[PDB]
Amino acid sequence: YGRLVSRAAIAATAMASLLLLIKIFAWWYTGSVSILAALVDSLVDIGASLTNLLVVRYSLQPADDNHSFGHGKAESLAALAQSMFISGSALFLFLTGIQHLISPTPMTDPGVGVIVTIVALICTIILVSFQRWVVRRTQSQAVRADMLHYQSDVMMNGAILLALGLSWYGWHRADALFALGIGIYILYSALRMGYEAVQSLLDRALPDEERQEIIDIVTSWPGVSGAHDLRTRQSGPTRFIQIHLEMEDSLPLVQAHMVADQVEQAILRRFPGSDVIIHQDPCSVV
Amino acid sequence: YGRLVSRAAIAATAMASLLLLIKIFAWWYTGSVSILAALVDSLVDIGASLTNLLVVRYSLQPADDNHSFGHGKAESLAALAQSMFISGSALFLFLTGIQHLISPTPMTDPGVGVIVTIVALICTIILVSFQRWVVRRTQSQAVRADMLHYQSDVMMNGAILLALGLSWYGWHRADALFALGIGIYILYSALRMGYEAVQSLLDRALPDEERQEIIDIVTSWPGVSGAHDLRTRQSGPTRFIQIHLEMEDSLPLVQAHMVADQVEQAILRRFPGSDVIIHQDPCSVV
Ligand SMILES: [Zn+2]
Numbered sequence A, B: 001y002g003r004l005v006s007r008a009a010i011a012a013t014a015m016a017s018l019l020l021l022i023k024i025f026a027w028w029y030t031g032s033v034s035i036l037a038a039l040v041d042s043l044v045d046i047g048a049s050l051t052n053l054l055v056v057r058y059s060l061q062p063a064d065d066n067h068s069f070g071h072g073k074a075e076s077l078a079a080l081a082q083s084m085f086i087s088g089s090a091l092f093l094f095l096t097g098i099q100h101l102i103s104p105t106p107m108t109d110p111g112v113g114v115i116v117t118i119v120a121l122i123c124t125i126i127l128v129s130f131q132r133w134v135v136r137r138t139q140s141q142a143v144r145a146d147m148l149h150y151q152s153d154v155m156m157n158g159a160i161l162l163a164l165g166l167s168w169y170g171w172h173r174a175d176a177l178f179a180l181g182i183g184i185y186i187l188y189s190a191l192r193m194g195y196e197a198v199q200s201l202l203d204r205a206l207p208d209e210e211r212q213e214i215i216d217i218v219t220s221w222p223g224v225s226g227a228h229d230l231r232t233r234q235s236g237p238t239r240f241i242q243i244h245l246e247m248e249d250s251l252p253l254v255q256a257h258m259v260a261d262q263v264e265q266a267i268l269r270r271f272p273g274s275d276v277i278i279h280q281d282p283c284s285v286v
């Protein structure tokens, strides 16, 4: 089920060792060999790992079973933050700004910093295009998919992509660095993550689809006329009422369990939800 | 049910007109009559209203029924923020600091500001001790109960509570203003709200109690030996399997619906959950 196809391990590893390795380390600057580097979104990127790592190691048990009845919502939650807040807002240490005053133009910023071994990384892209494998091999219910924090925390598209002496003087970041955030942050986490997130409100019961599937599977048994109601949600959950809305509308006998249970069972299709549950109603809302 | 006892209206009003009135306005300073006042946690307190107001006006329908299947989790969510973040962290614009350097001591802060008509408010306490009525008349599933943002956004316990010439020179805020945050913020939202919040992971299935009640009600019908399983959560939700784990362990007939439905029904006790649902199992996990 989750060897590959489900959160089983696929969702176990990435930002649980994408981070335990790539940006566990990559730099030995201002200390031994004292050339300047102010970027330590490294220890800042480290919160990101342990965070997710442990958090997903909790998106992940049968529960505090009693209390935490049966969880991992957890992730969707630990997405909500990363998203809207703390990225998709990590955007806002540049919405625009430095474009007009004596800053990006002819003087202040198109000169300083010809000491760049920042190219040391951008290799790291390796372990986004691995977080990328995680994606639909199974979304860590897309919780990994804060990844794109990296798919833009590896957006040195000014750095190692300069318009050095061809047309743009110091307008190198005024674009090909400004929109960067805008439509890959606002319309990133500050929707995306800000969403699976927001269905931390269980709802979206489903995508009309397995909605569809679901129904037609149940609609079609021996446990026929008597489909009453689906309701649905994340990591699994479905449920419900049916049986004989033609006569076995009391008539039958509890044999006619497994029959639902057949149904239920037959709502395998997925990998799964619960024994997303049947109340097996005889007598008819008509 | 919710006239008074449930979120019906009680949860409709407070921070949906606690804020629409109290700090809709209270001040006309630097403009007409130009005495100084830098505090506009007023327009900042206004986000707080509309926010909650509208949000609770959504903690509150049958759903985007299809998608948002049947919601209001919403609040618990809109608590999570207020809490841990954006208060219980609004604490940290003072953990301590101004205690030692020439700031609170003999010179800088125990002198400036003898112009205080800040006493204009502290009346506002009126509409916390109304948010206080909201509490258990029904917790707006304690979402209102970000209120205590006010129960500490009305913590002028330096202001209009000075140790002016009795023992403490300028040590007036170094205490009776420092701990203020600590153990009414950290151990406030940054647990409290940071919690109902975190059970945005449905879980806490319940408080062993109505857990208890629940069970013994079901345990005790004509729908006897055959209690299988509770599972539980917020605004209502319960569910489950039972019937005849002594013989009507297939034997009976779907008459024996309402019998669960009796049960279910009889899990009135609360105001309620769902028709927190029964799968009525004959043949026995034994
Ligand atoms: Zn029924």
Ligand SMILES: [Zn+2]
Pocket (backbone or CB within 6 Å): A257, A261, B241, B279, B281
């Ligand atoms: Zn069963």
